[PDB]
Design an enzyme around this catalytic site. Structure first.
Site, mmCIF file in Angstrom:
data_model
loop_
_atom_site.group_PDB
_atom_site.id
_atom_site.type_symbol
_atom_site.label_atom_id
_atom_site.label_comp_id
_atom_site.label_asym_id
_atom_site.label_seq_id
_atom_site.Cartn_x
_atom_site.Cartn_y
_atom_site.Cartn_z
ATOM 1 N N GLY A 137 -5.711 5.161 -4.834
ATOM 2 C CA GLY A 137 -6.937 5.522 -4.149
ATOM 3 C C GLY A 137 -7.651 6.684 -4.804
ATOM 4 N N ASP A 181 -6.839 -4.073 -3.778
ATOM 5 C CA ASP A 181 -5.565 -3.818 -4.433
ATOM 6 C C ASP A 181 -4.511 -4.770 -3.885
ATOM 7 N N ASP A 229 -5.044 -10.250 -3.396
ATOM 8 C CA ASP A 229 -4.845 -10.519 -4.814
ATOM 9 C C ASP A 229 -6.177 -10.924 -5.433
ATOM 10 N N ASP A 233 -8.919 -0.284 -12.753
ATOM 11 C CA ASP A 233 -7.826 0.575 -13.191
ATOM 12 C C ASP A 233 -6.516 -0.208 -13.237
ATOM 13 N N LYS A 284 -10.150 -0.635 -17.705
ATOM 14 C CA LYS A 284 -9.033 -0.076 -18.455
ATOM 15 C C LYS A 284 -8.230 -1.207 -19.085
#
Lengths: 458, 298, 50, 55
Positions: free
Chosen positions: B45, B65, B81, B106, B146
């Site tokens: 978070g 998430d 998911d 991320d 990322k």
RNA sequence: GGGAAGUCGGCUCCGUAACU
């Protein structure tokens, strides 16, 4: 083929250094050995290939010199980045310093490397040795030759002036442009003076204000020595450049620019008709500044000295037939439109449009009739097309001249007076409108009826 | 425990992934003008805390998430998911008629099994974020992802060139030097009306590639007669004024350094003599002013 | 003349000293023999002839 | 100091900068506003647009 | 959050058919 074999190892170098650049510093060195063998087709294919390689591997932050498992693994790759990238630049500097012309089939080494450098300098900025990439661009901009690569570097530089928010690359550029022309002798094709105009930073806060303070002081000192140099075409860009950016710098220095151009008026009063007219719409533009008109109560910026200069030169501007010659405010070449943008700003100001003195309206319109006598045809209609707009906005304040019952009988008219209020145009009526009916009817006479119809409509 | 982790506990941030985001946004500024951030793989978070610290108290933050995220004010988080149809329906129900301005990722798999498999899992997880960006983002939006540097990083960057106008790959200095992650920021979503399915298929993307000329001599003698020094001009001033005559000038010229040889001697001998035979004579301010006017050129 | 004075300011004569003559209002100019006498005094190689 | 009448009905000085725009400017953390002449931001119109219409 | 105060507060667009 050697070329096909050299292309295969080049792609193998390019793929491995882009898949994972870390593991192979020896790929970077072997790429330099492929970049150093003297076969012209290979040199073209190499240079474009590891230009895009360093477009893909250079990080977003600066790296310091080392001096003095995985951490040491990073630094050896880090020194491999800078030394290999630095070895680009003297190779690029020697490639740029070599001769241009060759066979017509393709650009051998000059235009291709300059295009690669221009594309590289559109991404390098955040990284170091940009000055070495900039010094190539100063060197090519110093050759004083119009070319495709010339406008490429001009377009490449003007991208950085319109993209660099930090402005450190912009500051490094303008410092070299000053060092360009203190080493040389006022011999630009005016291109860097427009490159000053596409600078965005003139148009974190403490560092940015210091960055503004450096770029404002040095670049105005560059035009300061240009005015001392007295180059005529450089004056047009400088007075265009000075018209935009005069409101940023402090009160006394900005009033000194008016005193500087006042000395330029005295120097011309000692070509000269144009240079005064280049200076004419310039000082009218500084007053046209919205913050500067808001600074009418924050400075005396007064033009009553300057209209009297135009009034006494309206005779000489009428005599010269050089008026027509071969989104810009100042840099217009022809003095016909320069006279228009002057004479628009005098009798029709943007601000305080209806607050104009009466004798200035009577004298400038009477001399406009004298301008209607000695002028070519194209300048005539626009001089005509201006002066209905003068009457249609002002009307009865100037309509005393056309009617003889509205004529004051103080003293006889003096056409050659040193001051606008010195002449007394309320005594003379206007008869040069009759002289313009005798002028070609199809075009000139149209505006005359439009002048008289709007006059009756008032 | 590094410096950025200690700054996370001091500033209240849940992880050091926050400090990569702010310093990324300090470089660009894509969060100061956005209403919607679709945060994918947002555990724990930290990226939502940055996104909450920089926007309007009237804008929408949605975090997705696989792990349950603790509740954050002004941030809506749910557990799903990201590759499932139920997830994109839940985001659509939350978004209603509003499109995403920024889409963040991320994502990081459970590393430790194999480096090639973890990089391939990271590369495809970045791609599951890539199709999720395509229908949710508004035109001109931002896509930040990322990804580990690997063999497929070329392929993932190439698709970013196709679907986005301006794309940069950048290492935040706040990130680990040991870690092989890299952050790719994409700007200017081109809004195509048709997207190639092979451009969004992991099996297709990650496939390995296989006359008169007589002149008299007067222009050379005249510089030798022309006055240079101030002492000679003072003598010239004394001759011009009615003070000294020809006989006085010859007599004053008869100094101790007369009747000397100056022709048949070498250069170094006469140079030392010329340096050491200068007499001291009085000068006047009128001669000094006049020699300044003489030496003043154009 | 104004043109003669302008030419004198651009290129001064050999005998120019910047001194006003006490006899005439024109500026005093040294003669050729006077200028040769100053040079022979300053150089000192031949102060007196023959 | 010129004296006007405010919305509260109390006689307020004419030039009073209360602080609501300053509060507005970090409530959504907007940047500097445009000057007169610069282009609109397609963001800034859609951030603060109008509603469906029935107010 | 509440009470008080001041107010003038609370009590057109989509699809379909002929016409330019």
């Amino acid at each position: 083929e050697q070329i096909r074999q050299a292309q295969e190892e080049l792609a193998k170098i390019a793929t491995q250094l882009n898949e994972n650049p870390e593991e192979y510093p020896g790929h970077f060195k072997a790429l330099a050995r492929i970049g150093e063998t003297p076969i012209l087709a290979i040199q073209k294919l190499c240079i474009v290939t590891q230009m895009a390689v360093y477009k893909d591997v250079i990080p977003g932050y600066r790296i310091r010199p080392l001096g003095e498992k995985e951490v040491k693994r990073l630094r050896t790759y880090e020194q491999a980045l800078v030394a290999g990238y630095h070895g680009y630049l003297k190779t690029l500097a020697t490639y740029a310093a070599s001769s241009i012309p060759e066979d017509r089939k393709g650009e051998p080494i000059s235009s291709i490397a300059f295009t690669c450098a221009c594309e590289l300098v559109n991404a390098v900025p955040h990284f170091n040795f940009r000055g070495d990439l900039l010094r190539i661009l100063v060197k090519k901009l110093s050759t004083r030759k119009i070319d495709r690569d010339f406008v490429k570097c001009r377009e490449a530089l003007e991208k950085l002036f319109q993209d660099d928010e930090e402005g450190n690359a912009s500051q490094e550029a303008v410092s070299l442009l000053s060092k360009m022309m203190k080493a040389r002798e006022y011999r630009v094709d005016e291109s860097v003076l427009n490159l000053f105009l596409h600078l965005r930073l003139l148009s974190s806060h403490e560092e940015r204000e210091r960055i503004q303070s450096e770029i404002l002081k040095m670049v105005f000192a560059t035009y300061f020595r240009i005015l001392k140099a007295r180059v005529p075409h450089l004056m047009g860009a400088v007075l265009e450049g000075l018209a935009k950016y005069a409101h940023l710098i402090n009160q006394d220095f900005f009033g000194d620019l008016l005193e500087a151009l006042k000395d330029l008026i005295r120097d011309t009063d000692r070509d000269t008709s144009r240079e005064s007219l280049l200076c004419t719409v310039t000082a009218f533009a500084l007053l046209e500044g919205q913050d500067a008109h808001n600074a009418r109560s924050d400075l005396h910026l007064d033009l009553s000295f300057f209209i009297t200069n135009l009034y006494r030169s309206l005779l000489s501007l009428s005599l010269n037939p050089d008026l027509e010659l071969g989104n810009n405010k100042i840099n217009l070449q022809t003095t016909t439109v320069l006279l228009l943008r002057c004479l628009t700003s005098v009798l029709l100001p943007p601000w305080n449009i209806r607050s104009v003195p009466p004798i200035r309206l009577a004298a400038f319109c009477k001399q406009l009739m004298t301008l209607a006598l000695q002028v070519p045809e194209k300048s005539s209609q626009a001089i005509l097309g201006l002066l209905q707009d003068v009457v249609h906005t002002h009307g009865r304040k100037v309509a005393a001249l056309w009617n003889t019952e509205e004529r004051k009988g103080d003293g006889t008219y003096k056409p050659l007076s040193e001051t606008v209020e010195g002449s007394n145009p309320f005594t003379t009526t206007i008869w040069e409108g009759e002289l313009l009916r005798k002028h070609y009817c199809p075009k000139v006479r149209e505006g005359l009826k439009a002048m008289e119809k709007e006059l009756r409509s008032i | 425990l590094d410096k950025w982790y200690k700054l996370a506990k001091e500033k209240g941030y849940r992880a050091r992934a926050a400090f990569k985001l702010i310093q990324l946004n300090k470089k660009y500024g894509f969060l100061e003008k956005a209403k919607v951030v679709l945060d994918l793989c947002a555990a724990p978070g930290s990226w939502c805390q940055v996104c909450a610290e920089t926007m309007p108290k009237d804008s929408l933050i949605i975090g997705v998430d696989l792990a349950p995220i603790k509740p954050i004010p002004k941030v809506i988080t749910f557990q799903s998911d990201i590759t499932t149809e139920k997830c994109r329906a839940t985001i659509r129900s939350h978004l209603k008629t509003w499109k995403a301005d920024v889409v963040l990722h991320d994502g990081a798999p459970n590393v430790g099994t194999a480096w090639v498999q973890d990089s391939y899992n990271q590369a495809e997880l970045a791609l599951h974020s890539l199709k999720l960006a395509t229908e949710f983002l508004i035109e001109g939006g931002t896509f930040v992802t990322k990804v580990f540097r690997s063999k497929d990083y070329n392929k993932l960057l190439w698709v970013c060139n196709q679907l986005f106008t301006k794309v940069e790959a950048t290492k935040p200095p706040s990130s680990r030097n040991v870690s092989a992650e890299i952050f790719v920021v994409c700007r200017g979503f081109k809004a195509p009306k048709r997207i190639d399915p092979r451009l969004l298929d992991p099996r297709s993307i990650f496939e390995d590639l296989a006359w008169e000329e007589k002149e008299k001599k007067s222009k050379d003698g005249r510089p030798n007669i022309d006055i240079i020094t101030a002492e000679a001009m003072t003598l010239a001033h004394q001759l011009a004024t009615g003070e000294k005559t020809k006989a006085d000038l010859i007599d004053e010229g008869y100094n101790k350094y007369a009747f000397k040889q100056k022709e048949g001697l070498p250069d170094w001998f006469l140079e030392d003599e010329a340096k050491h035979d200068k007499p001291i004579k009085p000068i006047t301010k009128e001669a000094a002013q006049a020699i300044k006017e003489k030496l003043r050129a154009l | 003349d104004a043109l003669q004075n302008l030419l004198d300011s651009i290129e001064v004569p050999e005998g120019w000293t910047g001194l006003t003559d006490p006899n005439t209002g024109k500026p005093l100019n040294l003669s050729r023999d006077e200028l040769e006498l100053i040079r022979k005094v300053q150089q000192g190689l031949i102060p007196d002839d023959v | 100091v010129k004296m006007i009448r405010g919305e509260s009905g109390v006689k307020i000085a004419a030039s009073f900068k209360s602080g609501r725009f300053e509060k507005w400017r970090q409530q959504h953390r907007l940047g500097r506003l445009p000057q007169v002449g610069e282009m609109e931001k397609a963001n800034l119109v859609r951030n603060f647009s109008l509603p469906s219409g029935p107010r």
